[PDB]
């Protein structure tokens, strides 16, 4: 473990890789120009929350893989939201549908998080899906947060 921090009520422990923060300007789906510290590099984490856990593999503004384990669908959705925000993917940025400011949180990453925690339907809808293969212990999760053995949110599996 080369780093431990908390984000969105999950403890992230970095198990591999590294990154450097670079300030960058992005345009939200509400057409707000935001300055964010983009994490540049490939990293793997375990995420541990009160009600769910996950493995997250990610690179610069890119979710590679997320395998989530939770008690119920709500708990799994929470982990998925945090991971999608933390990924900094432009898809997630473009799913934003209101203004973000200090009203929402102390930095833009928290503002984005709070935005999607209120309502993740546009995020989940716009993220993308993919067919999946069969793997013991794992299943797909659709945008409406129901399970599927056939398709899943892009890069996401439930254990």
Automatic annotation (TrEMBL):
It comes from the Viruses. Residues 2-159 form the Influenza RNA polymerase PB2 CAP binding domain. It is found in: Host mitochondrion; Virion; Host nucleus. Influenza RNA polymerase is composed of three subunits: PB1, PB2 and PA. Belongs to the influenza viruses PB2 family. Plays an essential role in transcription initiation and cap-stealing mechanism, in which cellular capped pre-mRNAs are used to generate primers for viral transcription. Recognizes and binds the 7-methylguanosine-containing cap of the target pre-RNA which is subsequently cleaved after 10-13 nucleotides by the viral protein PA. Plays a role in the initiation of the viral genome replication and modulates the activity of the ribonucleoprotein (RNP) complex. This is Polymerase basic protein 2. It comes from Influenza A virus. The chain holds residues 319 to 481 of 759 of the full protein.
């Amino acid at each position: 473990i080369s780093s431990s921090f908390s984000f969105g009520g999950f403890t992230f422990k970095r198990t591999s890789g590294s990154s450097v923060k670079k300030e960058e300007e992005v345009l939200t789906g509400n057409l707000q120009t935001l300055k964010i510290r983009v994490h540049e590099g490939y990293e793997e984490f375990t995420m541990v929350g009160r009600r769910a856990t996950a493995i997250l593999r990610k690179a610069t503004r890119r979710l590679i893989q997320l395998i989530v384990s939770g008690r119920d669908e709500q708990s799994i959705a929470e982990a998925i939201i945090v991971a999608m925000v933390f990924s900094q993917e432009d898809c997630m940025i473009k799913a934003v549908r209101g203004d973000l400011n200090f009203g929402s949180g102390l930095n833009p990453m928290h503002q984005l998080l709070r935005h999607f925690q209120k309502d993740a339907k546009v995020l989940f809808q716009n993220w993308g899906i993919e067919p999946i293969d069969n793997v013991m212990g794992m299943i797909g999760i659709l945008p409406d947060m129901t399970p599927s053995t056939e398709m899943s949110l892009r890069g996401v599996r439930v254990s």
